[PDB]
Symmetry: C2
Subunit: 381 residues, 2 copies
Amino acid sequence: SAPLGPFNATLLEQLKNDYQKGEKEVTRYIELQEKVAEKYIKMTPLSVTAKKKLPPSKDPRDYMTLSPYWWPDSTKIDGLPYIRKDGERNPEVYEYPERENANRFGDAAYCLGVLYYITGKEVYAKACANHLRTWFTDPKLGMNPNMTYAQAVPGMKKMRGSGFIDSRRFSRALGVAKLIEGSKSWTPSDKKKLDDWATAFCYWMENSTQGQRESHAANNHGLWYEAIHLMVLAYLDRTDRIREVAEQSILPKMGAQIADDGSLPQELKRTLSLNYSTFALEALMEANQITSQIGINLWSTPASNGKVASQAVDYLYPFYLNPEDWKFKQIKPFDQSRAAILLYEAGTALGNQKYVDTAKRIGLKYSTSDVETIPYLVLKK
Amino acid sequence: SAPLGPFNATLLEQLKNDYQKGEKEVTRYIELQEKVAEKYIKMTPLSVTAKKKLPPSKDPRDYMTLSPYWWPDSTKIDGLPYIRKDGERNPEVYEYPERENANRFGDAAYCLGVLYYITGKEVYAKACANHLRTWFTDPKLGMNPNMTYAQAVPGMKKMRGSGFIDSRRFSRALGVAKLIEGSKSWTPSDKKKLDDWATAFCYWMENSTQGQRESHAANNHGLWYEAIHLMVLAYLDRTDRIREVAEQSILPKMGAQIADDGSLPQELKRTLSLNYSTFALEALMEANQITSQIGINLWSTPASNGKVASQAVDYLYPFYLNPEDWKFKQIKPFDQSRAAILLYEAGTALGNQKYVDTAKRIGLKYSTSDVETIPYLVLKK
């Protein structure tokens, strides 16, 4: 039975079980994963400190990115204040190294942590530990436990908390650290430092003005905040906080953000409305992976007004079959393959065989290196 | 009468003349442009050598970028060879600093050079010279006169000349160097070094296998190749060659690309078909800015097959009025403001008053800092 963390635990346990029983199809799949993971063993661990332009705090350990849809105003002599173009990512984002480096670190730690859980090979713990140590707890290279300067916007006067959604990059990694506990490489001293970091991070996201405001956001951001919250709480073994968050924040938000016909109106007004509808349901999917490990099914548990998250899947399913029928603003092509994991996750949670069949038909590539697809051999056949 | 160069010489001579006579409306506009140009006076000159990852020659003075629609194959252990996704720019392009740095050099040098031509203020020639010397002729920081590793593709076995299209980002800057000749800052020794660079670059694009191949391209790349070709030849005062290239390469190429209804079938098969149809005409437009300075109007001169560039403008015009009516694949929204300069250029060339009125109706923002709009006060209200 798997430790509590940010993954489909049913799929992980069944992979680990069939690997240990020497079943051939899984064993061959895991060996492919082991050859994918080799580059993460060699990979030099990343740090948020690897940047030149320092945040206003003058501290390189503070995470800082640019908010993606904000662009310099050509009609101003300095381009300030930046203006918003919903759905059009400003390539300046890539001048902030932590934007892609937190994504790379997250992939490395998640891949190595899962393969350690599945094979028991210490080489995977040792490498995962090296990434976790450097990114999180190192007294020089570790990030400070806050998201103060995430998605800054040049010229913007007010402080904002929307950047907190960047945290999902490293928070999955934070949760996977629990899989390497008991290894020879993850020492008790290593565990205490990360526990203390996660405690400091949970405090900040629950009590800073930015984290409070993000906890009250009325769209997919509010759902993703709670998805991240659950990973932090799950890492810290606070399963009663997970129950409280699900019932006092996630279910109310789901009850407010789903409309009577099952649409997500807050996402319907975006320039990538099919992306953001799906993005909201992805925040529910990752939350549910955690809550359902303690008996809480967020796809079928009603909000106080009777609405259930499966209604929003129902609304979107015809368009996952045919993204071209989508009749709302969508200024870039929807990636249909996002519906594979999503329909598989919601389909199984609901005993909806039509959803699971459609997930497997859409499928995932057997030899893809996309580290999020590791548990989903079930979709690669 | 302005030196031969890559700009609308009629508008530029108009601006400089009205500036010298002290006309208020033009003086206000130049004074704005000078405020915008201040950041280029301060800007540190860029060099292609400012990269860590070197090209296969191990020479930092060779330009190297990634072909923008080529992505790692996730189904491969090393991601190699990359695969193509037409229209989807791979953010990895930004890991090659000369991709954006050649654009920033281009804007700074062109802006400063045009302002020196219009105003006579030696401070603009002196700064333009600083950027030119550093990008082109400096014996340590200057770029080699070739495009051998432009738009390289990892894993691709064959050599390609598609990368040559990047040259447009610095070949306009080369062209405006002609505007600072006679200044105090641009010495006969500066001119001779640049002349020799430009000769070497011209030899490479005409005789290398990649240059030869690119000169034969049957879509917009053939047009851009010759448009870039004209900037280099005009800079070298090879007006006889400009005629030959116009008469024997551009017009046949343009005629072979236009279909009976005026559409451009090679661009219609792209995922950004309206972008690429407009991109094709933009090459013709920039080429005509140079040909029409020696009496060849590319918009109205038919090719041997009876096709004339004005047929292509005519087919695209309704969709510049209403871009949403475009009925071919277009996986990002079309930037309508591109029609402003395009319809004004072709509209004046053809004496079509309807094209010119629409150009002004779409318009450019009076205070924009986009350097390519500097000559078009006539489109700014």
